[PDB]
Structure 1
């Protein structure tokens, strides 16, 4: 099972000097006892193509500019490592796809890649194609020539990411090569990227269908067989996440991030209480990720608007406008059609910027994250309470880059001096050291105004009380989270997690 300790999510090259070795040095020298594990975002060949690692030419080969598998082995001595298995697609410059461009149906890899005809051998109606779930408008096809013949190749994301047939012999062999490589390279945990898209079937949405369930359970068993805990990435209507969670080791809690933005901007905690009541507890919790903020993950089902979310859709709309206001238009320049994006409706902003850089709100959001059942992950920009990177956004025109700043070691050290960053480091140490979090969880609530989360352990207990109504407003300085706990040294309390961070005896 996944260790119950806070993890860092990072690019190997955007934290430190630009290599896995430097990333490792930063973790060990500056976050000892803070981050006990790390999800290294894709570091395979190449890391800087069409989609920042997620279009691998060779998924089993570390980009030689970043380091080697030996570096990953070294890191594993001090940190449990999560990596991606990119199971849905690969680069069009992969040897496999290039072979198909060259030889078409004579290629041994022809069956490995999905085309329109793969899935719709007798053609498709408009309803058939319109019903395919998409993260942005436009059909999931682009033109490639197979031995000179124009073909419509299935592409869920960029046209450079060609989708594999996960039910083909060649496709499956490729996926198992990834699992074998990770098992042999001292990786602990696997993230199944975009796995909800991995199964296609004519007349279905091709997203989180019964065929997808079969794929997910098959991949999970291949993980367990190799000692790899499987986390699936699924941004979906919330009920689908609750459903699928009983079939895998971990799901993300993608509802919490926008639920907390809603709570912190309106004062309403009832939706957080309801989510606490029903959520899968085999979770990996986040606020920020390397993608945009999935505000729609708490909204109505996009393929059936009558299935309502955790908040009314009008509240999602309000949330989006609030982020835009809090970032003074920054998120508007990065979000949706305003920049290049895979997800039309995710909001591109750092989480700290989305809160208008309010320290009390931000530390409160992390405290709530750490107190809900699940293994917590902190994205590296969030680990340094990072603001929107408008210069990088202007340079690349890639919307998500607003939240993918390159941190030199010098900039890391500068940010480590900030009270809010010191507070997060201390909070994560606390979350790693108190045995209460390995015990039994309970919560109480005061009708939409207050919620208190309690853990009771073998030798400790802790209660976090969250009351955003106390400090509404981007310039508010009033604490909205309070912490009480018992350890070796008796009862303790902090009423201001920034001014008085908790330390376990």
Structure 2
């Protein structure tokens, strides 16, 4: 996967509301900045319950957004990452409606998982109890096949029915999706809910062998079409390092909350630790289109005894430091869990989570870009955006606080801000200097300082990071220093907003 910075955006929430308008904004206002892009699901429909992840037809672009040819057009300039939902589909898909009508008789009946599919001899209490759940209850709901009442496997909502991926119709279906992906020249595929995709009795049905088997099968099928695979997994971090070894790429989900901590406190050990132990076949992010996941660095969900990269109190003080820095907006948006070790995500923008502090933000981005992996930026953070309370109050959907519909006017108006210009400058720097295609080294003091070093062929760079040097939401003291070597020799930057870095 190309080592240039990628952008993450909705088609309709950046520009006029379309794939072409998106491509326009991307080409005209971001050239050299984002050389690649991740387009969040654009299939039929895009405006549903879960904002694209519950398509009715995965194979077809929403005709309000565009077509496949808009995708193919965009492939010529930019590398493109797209979503493939491999675990489930709409109960309003023709395939499932057909099973509903004809029951066993045909033809899609085997495509779909039931309790009998996995558990032909019954299930124990322990059988069902041990299953990993992103959502509450049992992963089963009631539906009627022809006339007979059936329990159908459901991982997330009763509306998204789980496919048996080892079956022929199920595989035939996933391959209809890849074939269309390759036809429009997608580079990179995000495999969604793939952790949950393989069910075997007596297991947690989450990241078991049968699942790796499925992933490697999908990998080989992808490389055959020139598609690299990427898995999205929120879990206990040791499982993450476990998983990460046996696949091509993964998200780095630890770093954003880690940076929130360090900018909050000034303790950098945890980060020197993560730098030492993190998997480097990664995609790095700060913000995504879901909330800030705190479960990643916390204690394990099933067994509270396995402790993260900080104490449970420091996770509590993180959820509450966000709540405080945004003066209660995340409270409005994050539904209360009665405790903070029970939270998955804290819904807020990563600018707001910093109390709209520019020095802290830009430092965070710097560190993200210095660590090994391919960096991604989300449109809202590319625009350094604040929490949107109107939509949140419009839709009552927590995650909409971090998804703002940006018209072109708003983009060009937010483009004027110095922090936005510093971020742009910094991506361009990350893209143009060849030192990053090189080798990575790091140094730490104890707590006060960490230095990240890259050395390439014609060029060198080092970023030193000291959150102790200034503290607090309104503190304007630069916490990151930069030095580098290129055609023009040894250069330096002690403030990354006012004195942004350029290459020769």
The alpha carbon displacement at 1:390 in A equals: 1.2
The answer to whether the 8 A contact 1:12-1:41 is kept is yes
The alpha carbon displacement at 1:50 in A equals: 2.1
The alpha carbon displacement at 1:379 in A equals: 0.7
The answer to whether the 8 A contact 1:296-1:316 is kept is no
The answer to whether the 8 A contact 2:354-2:361 is kept is yes
The answer to whether the 8 A contact 2:155-2:162 is kept is yes
Q: Would the alpha carbon gap of residues 60 and 256 (structure 1) be closer, same or farther in structure 2, given more than 3 Å must change?
A: same
Q: Would the alpha carbon gap of residues 130 and 337 (structure 1) be closer, same or farther in structure 2, given more than 3 Å must change?
A: farther
The answer to whether the 8 A contact 2:8-2:379 is kept is yes
Q: Work out the CA distance in 1 between the residues paired with 2:502 and 2:10.
A: 29
The alpha carbon displacement at 1:407 in A equals: 0.5
The answer to whether the 8 A contact 1:281-1:374 is kept is yes
Q: Would the alpha carbon gap of residues 27 and 503 (structure 1) be closer, same or farther in structure 2, given more than 3 Å must change?
A: same
The alpha carbon displacement at 1:112 in A equals: 1.1
Q: Work out the CA distance in 2 between the residues paired with 1:326 and 1:20.
A: 35
The answer to whether the 8 A contact 1:341-1:398 is kept is no
Please provide the CA RMSD for this pair: 2.0
Q: Give 5+ residue unaligned stretches, structure 2.
A: none
The answer to whether the 8 A contact 2:315-2:341 is kept is no
Q: Would the alpha carbon gap of residues 340 and 185 (structure 1) be closer, same or farther in structure 2, given more than 3 Å must change?
A: farther
Q: Would the alpha carbon gap of residues 303 and 339 (structure 1) be closer, same or farther in structure 2, given more than 3 Å must change?
A: closer
1:1-41 Cα offsets, whole Å, 9 max, x none, are x1110000011111001100000000000000110000001
Q: Give 5+ residue unaligned stretches, structure 1.
A: none
Moved over 6 A (4+): 338-343
The alpha carbon displacement at 1:150 in A equals: 2.7
Q: Work out the CA distance in 1 between the residues paired with 2:341 and 2:315.
A: 20
The alignment of Structure 1 onto Structure 2 pairs a total of residues equal to 504
The answer to whether the 8 A contact 2:316-2:340 is kept is no
Q: Would the alpha carbon gap of residues 344 and 262 (structure 1) be closer, same or farther in structure 2, given more than 3 Å must change?
A: closer
Q: Work out the CA distance in 2 between the residues paired with 1:328 and 1:137.
A: 30
Moved more, 6-15 or 142-151: 142-151
Moved more, 453-462 or 392-401: 392-401
Alignment of 1:284-303 (within 5 A): 284-303=283-302
The alpha carbon displacement at 1:343 in A equals: 10
The alpha carbon displacement at 1:427 in A equals: 0.5
The answer to whether the 8 A contact 1:196-1:207 is kept is yes
When the two structures are superposed, what TM-score results if normalisation uses the length of structure 1?
A: 0.97
Q: Work out the CA distance in 1 between the residues paired with 2:339 and 2:311.
A: 28
The answer to whether the 8 A contact 1:157-1:342 is kept is no
Q: Work out the CA distance in 2 between the residues paired with 1:90 and 1:339.
A: 32
Q: Work out the CA distance in 1 between the residues paired with 2:374 and 2:255.
A: 13
The answer to whether the 8 A contact 2:337-2:343 is kept is no
Equivalent in the alignment of 1:280: 279
The alpha carbon displacement at 1:437 in A equals: 0.5
Moved more, 140-149 or 86-95: 140-149
The alpha carbon displacement at 1:140 in A equals: 2.1
1:172-224 Cα offsets, whole Å, 9 max, x none, are 11111111111111100101112111111222111112222211211111111
Q: Work out the CA distance in 1 between the residues paired with 2:133 and 2:26.
A: 37
1:449-486 Cα offsets, whole Å, 9 max, x none, are 21100000111111011111112211111111111111
The answer to whether the 8 A contact 2:84-2:190 is kept is yes
The alpha carbon displacement at 1:420 in A equals: 0.9
1:69-122 Cα offsets, whole Å, 9 max, x none, are 110111111100000111111111111111112222223111111122222223
1:403-425 Cα offsets, whole Å, 9 max, x none, are 11111111111111111111100
The alpha carbon displacement at 1:386 in A equals: 0.8
The alpha carbon displacement at 1:337 in A equals: 5.0
Moved more, 367-376 or 205-214: 205-214
The answer to whether the 8 A contact 1:252-1:283 is kept is yes
Equivalent in the alignment of 1:172: 171
SS of 1:484 mapped into structure 2: strand
The answer to whether the 8 A contact 2:299-2:341 is kept is no
Q: Work out the CA distance in 1 between the residues paired with 2:481 and 2:169.
A: 54
The alpha carbon displacement at 1:124 in A equals: 2.5
The answer to whether the 8 A contact 1:141-1:154 is kept is yes
Q: Work out the CA distance in 1 between the residues paired with 2:416 and 2:182.
A: 38
The alpha carbon displacement at 1:303 in A equals: 2.3
Alignment of 1:8-407 (within 5 A): 8-336=7-335, 345-407=344-406
The alpha carbon displacement at 1:305 in A equals: 2.3
Moved more, 175-184 or 19-28: 175-184
Q: Work out the CA distance in 1 between the residues paired with 2:338 and 2:89.
A: 23
The answer to whether the 8 A contact 1:112-1:164 is kept is yes
Q: Work out the CA distance in 1 between the residues paired with 2:340 and 2:60.
A: 27
The answer to whether the 8 A contact 2:460-2:484 is kept is yes
The alpha carbon displacement at 1:338 in A equals: 8.3
The alpha carbon displacement at 1:364 in A equals: 0.6
Equivalent in the alignment of 2:468: 469
The alpha carbon displacement at 1:344 in A equals: 5.2
Q: Would the alpha carbon gap of residues 272 and 198 (structure 1) be closer, same or farther in structure 2, given more than 3 Å must change?
A: same
The answer to whether the 8 A contact 2:20-2:70 is kept is yes
Equivalent in the alignment of 1:503: 502
Q: Would the alpha carbon gap of residues 338 and 447 (structure 1) be closer, same or farther in structure 2, given more than 3 Å must change?
A: closer
Q: Work out the CA distance in 2 between the residues paired with 1:393 and 1:116.
A: 37
Q: Would the alpha carbon gap of residues 233 and 407 (structure 1) be closer, same or farther in structure 2, given more than 3 Å must change?
A: same
Moved more, 258-267 or 194-203: 194-203
Q: Work out the CA distance in 1 between the residues paired with 2:465 and 2:209.
A: 39
The answer to whether the 8 A contact 1:50-1:158 is kept is no
The answer to whether the 8 A contact 2:14-2:408 is kept is yes
The answer to whether the 8 A contact 1:267-1:468 is kept is yes
The alpha carbon displacement at 1:149 in A equals: 2.8
